[PDB]
Design a protein around this ligand. Sequence first.
Ligand SMILES: Clc1cc(C[NH2+]CCc2c[nH]cn2)ccc1-c1ccccc1
Ligand SMILES: Cc1cc(O)cc(C(=O)O)c1
Length: 328
Amino acid sequence: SGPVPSRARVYTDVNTHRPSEYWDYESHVVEWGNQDDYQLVRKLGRGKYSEVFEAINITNNEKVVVKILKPVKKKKIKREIKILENLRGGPNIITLADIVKDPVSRTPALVFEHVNNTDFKQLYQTLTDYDIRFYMYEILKALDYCHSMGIMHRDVKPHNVMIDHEHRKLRLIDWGLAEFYHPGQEYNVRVASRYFKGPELLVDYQMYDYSLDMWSLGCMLASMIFRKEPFFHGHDNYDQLVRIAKVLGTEDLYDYIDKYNIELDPRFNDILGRHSRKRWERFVHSENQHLVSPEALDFLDKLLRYDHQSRLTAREAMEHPYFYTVVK
Ligand SMILES: Clc1cc(C[NH2+]CCc2c[nH]cn2)ccc1-c1ccccc1
Ligand SMILES: Cc1cc(O)cc(C(=O)O)c1
């Protein structure tokens, strides 16, 4: 009689026990400040619906990041602002400093603390086993905090993680896809980035939770310790599940869909095939061995599981032997 319901194993009712003012973003009143305070310096990147700039705040001569948003959907903008305000000051959460609109354009813009990001393609070959453990723990601080505040980031990936390596500072950014978690709620599965999409999204299982973020974090860990980017290289959303099945095996995939009475889309019929469960050790090679250890593999095995409920929570992950060498 349809799919089996599911709920988060942690922070299940945090939004339920809070007043609507906290989670009802649509009713949130946004106050837009004048944008004359900030002068744009240079473009940092372009999003599908946003443009990010490095900027100078004239009042204090301090660098800031300005995210100009193309207002395609008003509700989405309110959701990001509300979530940013709720999380403001949390560990490793990007800090929303201001919300402004340009006097003439009236286009929405978010102003953030500046983060001096070290090069994505240059950091990959210098990081040691310790650095990966250190930065993975910094991301877990952000995720445990946001999940505790009843929020799912829903877009965890390397692009959304800013690292100032010189100051060992990490920030989880772009909360545009983030959502409040309400037990029993059926969310839109068209979230995250293809390579980081949890099996729950790919099989159209809508009653997902914070555990989605842990799958995405598992994908990032696998790419880093094995030097294989992305780890699961799907060419489309259906092929993405096949790439996962080629590693995790098809037997555990059917156990997952049977546990939640998920109806597998017919598009999977000719592409899924049959795949044995691979051992994590088979991804170890001369180029990545210095980043791999039994602890790293045991930790990875506990994140990359079809069953979202069987994945470690951010707090359980922080207690893993893989992080015994890092300061808590
Ligand atoms: Cl090595 C690394 C690099 C990045 C890239 N961040 C730049 C994104 C960006 C560029 N421009 C705007 N945003 C993110 C995460 C990691 C990472 C992953 C696993 C474990 C430790 C670290
Ligand atoms: C500090 C920073 C940089 C960036 O590229 C985007 C954001 C965001 O939150 O989308 C924030």
